[PDB]
């Protein structure tokens, strides 16, 4: 039979519905949450753009095949261990954001197992100070 398009449909569906969940989640935010989320997009894009080269050199150390999943996290979380400043959080988030952008053929889960749990907890710690740093 004609099967040579089966994997294309699989890939596009997973992308499609994932984008639809995201839209469903954004829709259930109030305007304040939307304005904060908008600020996070723009902040990280600024940092990713102005530190394009710096991130590429950091991305190469993390990209090689040797690292375990915890080893990536422990490298990223090291900055947050001693330095809990909100800007350090924002840079960390922007770097995580850049890694996600380059892993568009890897599994989404592979990216989420870097961010979620420990790392996002440490960013959310004193979230009020983080939000205030971002919203001005």
């Amino acid at each position: 039979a004609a099967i040579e398009f089966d994997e294309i449909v699989k890939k596009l569906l997973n992308i499609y519905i994932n984008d639809i969940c995201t839209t469903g989640e954004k829709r259930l935010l109030n305007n304040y949450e939307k304005s904060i989320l908008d600020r996070i997009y723009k902040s990280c894009e600024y940092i990713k753009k102005n530190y394009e080269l710096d991130f590429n050199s950091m991305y190469n150390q993390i990209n090689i095949n040797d690292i375990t999943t915890s080893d990536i996290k422990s490298k990223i979380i090291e900055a947050l261990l001693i330095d809990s400043r909100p800007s350090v959080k924002l840079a960390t988030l922007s770097f995580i954001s850049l890694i996600a952008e380059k892993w568009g053929e890897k599994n989404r889960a592979k990216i989420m197992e870097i961010l979620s749990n420990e790392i996002v907890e440490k960013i959310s710690n004193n979230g009020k100070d983080f939000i205030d740093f971002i919203d001005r």
């Binding site: 940092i47 950091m58 900055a79 400043r85 740093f133």
Partner: peptide, 18 residues
């Protein structure tokens, strides 16, 4: 702590900016 050493560096430089 090489990646960490740069995240703070970017953090400092952006801290001054905003």
């Amino acid at each position: 702590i090489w990646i960490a050493q740069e995240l703070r560096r970017i953090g400092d430089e952006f801290n001054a900016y905003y």
